[PDB]
Amino acid sequence: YDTNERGGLAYATIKYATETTIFYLIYNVEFSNTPDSLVLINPTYTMTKV
Amino acid sequence: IKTTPYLEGDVLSSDSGPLLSVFALQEIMQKVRQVQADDVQKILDDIKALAAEQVYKIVKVPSISFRHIVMQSRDRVLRVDTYYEEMSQVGDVITEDEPEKFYSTIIKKVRFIRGKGSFILHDIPTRDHRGMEVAEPEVLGVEFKNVLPVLTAEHRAMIQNALDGSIIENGNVATRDVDVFIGACSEPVYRIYNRLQGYIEAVQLQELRNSIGWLERLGHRKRITYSQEVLTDFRRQDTIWVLALQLPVNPQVVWDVPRSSIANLIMNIATCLPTGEYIAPNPRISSITLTQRITTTGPFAILTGSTPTAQQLNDVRKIYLALMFPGQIILDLKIDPGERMDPAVRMVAGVVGHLLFTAGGRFTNLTQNMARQLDIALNDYLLYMYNTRVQVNYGPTGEPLDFQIGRNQYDCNVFRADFATGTGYNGWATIDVEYREPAPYVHAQRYIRYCGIDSRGIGMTYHCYNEMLRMLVAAGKDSEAAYFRSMLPFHMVRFARINQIINEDLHSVFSLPDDMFNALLPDLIAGAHQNADPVVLDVSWISLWFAFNRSFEPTHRNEMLEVAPLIESVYASELSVMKVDMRHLSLMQRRFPDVLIQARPSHFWKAVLNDSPEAVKAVMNLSHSHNFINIRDMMRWVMLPSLQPSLKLALEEEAWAAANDFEDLMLTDQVYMHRDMLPEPRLDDIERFRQEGFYYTNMLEAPPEIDRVVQYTYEIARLQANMGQFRAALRRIMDDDDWVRFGGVLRTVRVKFYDARPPDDVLQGLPFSYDTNERGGLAYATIKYATETTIFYLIYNVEFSNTPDSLVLINPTYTMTKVFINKRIVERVRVGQILAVLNRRFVAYKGKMRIMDITQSLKMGTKLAAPTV
């Protein structure tokens, strides 16, 4: 989404991304790390689904 | 891209030359000049200037409407309204027998008052005072700079308090948008200002939306690049929009003007026709040797290899110009009685013309005489046995091409011209005009397809060319048959380009409507033109052959193609304004038959056209020089209801309503004559006489009594002048102490000011002129009933060296002319009542607010604006 102004009128643009990605996450763990190591203080959000 | 070289006397050259948009106008103007025989840039920039029109002006400070005059006194001054001061000199002297000058003066006065009444305040100066916001005295409509250095301290303090009392009622309001203050302004211009303001606060967002939609629909057809952006409906909190013009112009407004075909053609070809360049079928033929170009014998061999002269390129341009405009440009042959040529060129031109042009069926490009000459030339070529002989059987009739030729009997009668069916030319058995879907312009929806080809060039042919090849092969002209066969792709590319240019670029409101386009050919067959007049261009024999070989390449598009709708709307609005002005003139003639000299529609049209934009003036003058007009056309045109709404129209209606009272136009018929005494006051006390502010003028503050005055008339005055008793009658009636009214006609009135004794010609001036000393022996004594009359004000200046009886003359001196106008143009006002003039309400904007015209923003249609839903 984008918007701009020329002259005395307001203008805006909308587009859809044509390339989408699907990823796979493999969680590797080792004896050293603490249980709280893999817990972030605040959430991380993901949007796209396919 | 450059043209193939052409010969300039003895040297080759390849300069492009003048633009096709400029060459066309010169040719049309030359033909018109030939019509009345018994600079182009100056016009082109004049049309181009219509894209930056304004009918208003943003002003910092309103013009002062009142001013004060000092009469060597400190107790009272004169208040003068400068509106009438500027108004009295707008027009020229009005005579009793020149209606054209009268109506031109009226129109000029109306235009002047409209121009003066339109202004918008942007940001007024202001000054704070005791916590209150007060507008500075400069923004007010009165000036009193010279008043201050003479007033006493008391009156100075009083007027200072009066100035400090000009508080802005909403000034203390925070985050406000506009400010309002009381001021002084003349009523005629205040009315126009109020009307303009009232038009302003009316929001017209839907009008802009519709205009943008129509621009997109037009850009659909004009092949304009599509911007990725889509317009949004938004309003900035710090912007105020103004829209002087409405975009969807009605074509009836522009096509209802009588004898406007030439005008519309010129405007369209100026605003839309693009330039181009000419290319030979084989490039760089100037480099190859002549021997490789001339290979055989015959007329075509002689024709091939010759290079065209520079002059014939102009005729090729004329031929192409006629090609772009089917029914509006027609060709004819230039034959000089004392010239000659090699018959081969005539033979080749006759052969080529049948394939190159079209005639009959739907429209024609050439006159009947040209068709007959081309048929005769083709006949002569067909009976030219230059290389081989074939048998031929002649027909019973003596008409050309009435024979059968070749071993296989081919009938050549089909190639004779016939405008009913168009067998002999490109209109043979093919359809070229069609309708597909509604166009952006409702008046013109047709499509033009030369040779039946469309853009939505190898192998395509048409019936006429195939028949041409068949007859050429049957006649035994085998050599040129191959040459014609090899030329098809070039010919089809040229005609495809012509169709592209016609259908894509030359589309505008000035294009001819479909009905008149269909009516041209039957009109031409009938011979008596009606409601349409074509223009004929003249070409030479060799020009046909040289045009058959040279193509047209649109190197550049027209510069003004982007701004066509704006000038179209401006032209339509100007036409509507002229129509409304003429209707108002007709109403004025209706209301006052007893004081107006006469009525004439032709004079109305001439007067309204006299004051107009120069480009419109020139275009209309050319159009009406080509074809004449009559009273019936004017009567038909002044009654059509079609109009193009705009700010100009509303301002004109308000100005006409304000100027309905002709006394505001400084025209008065209440001119009187009476012998009066020039006063000479006593001077017993110089200061006592000084402080009362004595002055004298010929003004009458009240009308005289209904009796004791004799009413004169133009007919009575003329009869008395012819009797020779006019002077004696007036002398007797003035010795009788009676008044006289010189009514029956409007007279121009001027205003003058004097301090010393005015010139004798002014004080003793007469409202008429009567000359009796002549040796002509005819017309006897000439009388001019209507002449200029002058308003004069006298200020008596006295010095301490004057004796009490210094102004006493031995014999009395008299004055004659008196007049009543019923308006206080000049007032004697005490110093205490100077500031009472401030009674009008004014509204202004702020610096934070920005005002701009949306019309410049709709320069071109490139932005879509949400779904219509």
XYZ file of N, CA, C and O in Angstrom, chain A residues 4-15, chain B residues 229-232 234 236 241 850 852 854 857 863:
96
model
N 0.312 9.139 -2.269
C 1.070 10.350 -2.548
C 0.114 11.419 -3.056
O -1.041 11.142 -3.386
N 0.607 12.653 -3.111
C -0.196 13.789 -3.537
C 0.536 14.573 -4.616
O 1.723 14.881 -4.476
N -0.181 14.889 -5.693
C 0.307 15.790 -6.725
C -0.766 16.833 -7.001
O -1.963 16.526 -6.976
N -0.334 18.064 -7.254
C -1.288 19.149 -7.421
C -2.111 19.337 -6.162
O -1.583 19.365 -5.045
N -3.426 19.463 -6.336
C -4.342 19.607 -5.224
C -5.172 18.388 -4.893
O -6.120 18.501 -4.104
N -4.860 17.223 -5.456
C -5.642 16.016 -5.250
C -4.794 14.950 -4.571
O -3.579 14.873 -4.779
N -5.446 14.129 -3.755
C -4.784 13.026 -3.076
C -4.841 11.768 -3.931
O -5.782 11.557 -4.701
N -3.817 10.929 -3.790
C -3.679 9.737 -4.612
C -3.152 8.585 -3.767
O -2.467 8.797 -2.763
N -3.477 7.359 -4.181
C -3.073 6.170 -3.442
C -2.984 4.977 -4.384
O -3.680 4.917 -5.401
N -2.128 4.019 -4.025
C -1.898 2.823 -4.826
C -1.985 1.579 -3.953
O -1.645 1.607 -2.767
N -2.439 0.482 -4.557
C -2.494 -0.822 -3.903
C -1.996 -1.877 -4.882
O -2.279 -1.809 -6.083
N -1.244 -2.849 -4.369
C -0.727 -3.936 -5.189
C -0.671 -5.209 -4.358
O -0.648 -5.171 -3.126
N -2.017 4.396 -10.867
C -2.755 4.926 -9.733
C -4.244 5.050 -10.048
O -4.651 5.230 -11.199
N -5.060 4.955 -8.997
C -6.504 5.138 -9.085
C -6.914 6.263 -8.138
O -6.548 6.254 -6.957
N -7.658 7.235 -8.662
C -7.962 8.451 -7.920
C -8.816 8.155 -6.691
O -9.680 7.275 -6.700
N -8.562 8.910 -5.624
C -9.287 8.789 -4.369
C -10.046 10.078 -4.082
O -9.620 11.168 -4.474
N -10.751 12.680 -1.682
C -10.220 13.272 -0.465
C -10.331 14.787 -0.544
O -10.330 15.371 -1.629
N -8.501 18.053 1.478
C -7.568 18.560 2.471
C -8.232 19.641 3.314
O -8.996 20.466 2.806
N -11.360 24.400 -3.156
C -11.341 24.140 -4.586
C -12.210 25.137 -5.341
O -13.247 25.590 -4.849
N -4.828 27.604 1.319
C -4.317 27.727 -0.038
C -5.456 27.480 -1.016
O -6.228 26.530 -0.850
N -6.446 27.019 -5.106
C -5.904 26.686 -6.412
C -7.033 26.184 -7.299
O -8.078 25.739 -6.817
N -8.749 23.672 -9.835
C -8.741 22.267 -10.223
C -8.646 22.109 -11.737
O -8.211 21.057 -12.223
N -5.502 21.027 -12.980
C -5.208 19.636 -12.556
C -5.803 18.650 -13.559
O -5.154 17.626 -13.829
N -5.926 9.375 -14.815
C -6.169 8.704 -13.507
C -7.602 8.170 -13.401
O -8.533 8.991 -13.443
